[PDB]
Each structure stands twice: as C-alpha cells, then as structure tokens.
Design an enzyme around this catalytic site. Structure first.
Site, mmCIF file in Angstrom:
data_model
loop_
_atom_site.group_PDB
_atom_site.id
_atom_site.type_symbol
_atom_site.label_atom_id
_atom_site.label_comp_id
_atom_site.label_asym_id
_atom_site.label_seq_id
_atom_site.Cartn_x
_atom_site.Cartn_y
_atom_site.Cartn_z
ATOM 1 N NE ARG A 160 -3.690 0.013 2.544
ATOM 2 C CZ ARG A 160 -3.718 1.213 3.130
ATOM 3 N NH1 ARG A 160 -2.731 1.641 3.913
ATOM 4 N NH2 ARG A 160 -4.811 1.955 2.985
ATOM 5 N NE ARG B 294 -16.957 -3.702 5.035
ATOM 6 C CZ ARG B 294 -16.704 -4.502 3.999
ATOM 7 N NH1 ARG B 294 -16.127 -4.026 2.906
ATOM 8 N NH2 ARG B 294 -17.028 -5.782 4.064
ATOM 9 C CD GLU C 5 -7.638 5.793 -7.307
ATOM 10 O OE1 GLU C 5 -7.089 5.432 -8.374
ATOM 11 O OE2 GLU C 5 -7.690 5.052 -6.271
ATOM 12 C CD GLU C 6 -8.550 5.754 -0.438
ATOM 13 O OE1 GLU C 6 -8.456 4.544 -0.792
ATOM 14 O OE2 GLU C 6 -8.271 6.166 0.706
ATOM 15 N NE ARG D 61 -7.636 -6.457 8.631
ATOM 16 C CZ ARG D 61 -8.504 -7.468 8.566
ATOM 17 N NH1 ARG D 61 -8.678 -8.284 9.595
ATOM 18 N NH2 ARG D 61 -9.200 -7.655 7.455
ATOM 19 C CE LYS D 62 -3.147 -12.041 6.730
ATOM 20 N NZ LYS D 62 -3.591 -13.443 6.541
#
Ligand SMILES: O=P(O)(O)O[C@H]1[C@@H](OP(=O)(O)O)[C@H](OP(=O)(O)O)[C@@H](OP(=O)(O)OP(=O)(O)O)[C@H](OP(=O)(O)O)[C@H]1OP(=O)(O)O
Ligand SMILES: [Cl-]
Ligand SMILES: [Cl-]
Ligand SMILES: [F-]
Ligand SMILES: [Mg+2]
Ligand SMILES: [Mg+2]
Ligand SMILES: [Mg+2]
EC number: 3.6.1.52
Length: 135
Positions: free
Chosen positions: A13, A34, A62-63, A82-83
């Site tokens: 990421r 979410r 984008e976000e 969350r890896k």
C-alpha cells in the site's frame, strides 16, 4: 484493480500525510468506507510495477480529491493484524477538487485536523496510522 504483495504475503500500500502547508500543522483525513463516522489516512493498494510515490498520489486523488507537491518518504509501516505494508509520504496540498471519485461514488468525506487531533481520532481503530505522525 490488481492487489500486489511483498515476498512475505503482506499487501502493498501507499498513503500520504496531506498537509495544508509546508508548516505541517494540519492534515487531511477521510472517512472510513465501511464506517463513515470514523477517520483514516487516505491510501490504498499499489498496482503491478507501480512506484510507491505514484500509488500514494493516485490513491489521495481518488479518496481525498486533493493534489499537491510530493515530499519525503516518512517510512514504511506494517499492520501485523491486517497483513499490509504501507509506504507513507508527505504531500503538501496545492489543489482541492470539488467532486472527486470517492465523493461521487461512496459519499466519502474529508476534513482538516490539527496533527494532535488527527492522532486522537486515529488511535482507537487505526493506531498504526496514528503512528505515522510520531516523528
Ligand atoms: O474491510 P474493511 O472495511 O476494514 O476495509 C479496509 C481494507 O481491509 P484490510 O484491513 O483487510 O486491508 C480494504 O482493503 P481491500 O479490501 O481494498 O483490499 C482497504 O482498502 P485499501 O487497502 O485502502 O485499498 P484501495 O481500495 O484504497 O486500493 C479499505 O480502505 P478504503 O480504501 O478506505 O475503502 C479499508 O477500509 P477503511 O479503512 O474502513 O476505509
Ligand atoms: Cl499546515
Ligand atoms: Cl493501518
Ligand atoms: F483504491
Ligand atoms: Mg483507494
Ligand atoms: Mg484505500
Ligand atoms: Mg486502490
């Protein structure tokens, strides 16, 4: 649209600390997709062969609907639960766009926070993102 992974299977990421100015006193957070009453640092998955700095600036556009002058890599941050492994860059915001991808698509919100307040709202659900501000 394609997730990528480091050799240890952690999702790759990139994210930016989107500061209002070179003073780095105020930072832009966006709402959780979410849980829209929660705040996060905008960021997301690196695409195949995508430079981390390019992925960081793309995901912020984008976000969060902002663009600016890319600054230093702050560090590389893992979320063991969350890896995933995130490259975190400074971005000095110079352009705020009105009707950006996630505003239109999912009603994502954005807000300026003083650094101390960004750390506070991130601490409970996103303590690794709170740590982005530690140094
Ligand atoms: O299941 P949840 O709601 O915890 O979703 C998490 C996360 O799951 P994880 O903890 O298993 O990695 C998503 O991963 P994926 O499911 O796309 O792989 C992540 O996408 P991401 O990494 O940013 O990747 P991009 O989509 O931005 O490229 C997403 O962020 P949003 O982009 O903000 O929607 C997060 O939501 P939240 O932080 O609440 O807003
Ligand atoms: Cl600032
Ligand atoms: Cl995290
Ligand atoms: F994304
Ligand atoms: Mg994204
Ligand atoms: Mg994301
Ligand atoms: Mg993405």
């Amino acid at each position: 649209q394609t997730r990528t992974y480091d050799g240890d299977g952690y999702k790759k990421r990139a994210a930016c600390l989107c500061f209002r100015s070179e003073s780095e006193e105020e930072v832009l957070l966006v709402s959780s997709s979410r849980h829209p009453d929660r705040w996060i640092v905008p960021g997301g998955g690196m695409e195949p062969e995508e430079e981390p700095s390019v992925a960081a600036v793309r995901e912020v556009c984008e976000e969060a609907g902002v663009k600016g002058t890319l600054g230093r890599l702050v560090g590389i941050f893992e979320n063991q639960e969350r890896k995933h492994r995130t490259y975190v860059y400074v971005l000095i915001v110079t352009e705020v766009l009105e009707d950006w991808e996630d505003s239109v698509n999912i009603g994502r919100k954005r807000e300026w926070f003083k650094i101390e307040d960004a750390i506070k709202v991130l601490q409970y659900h996103k303590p690794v993102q709170a740590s982005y501000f530690e140094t």
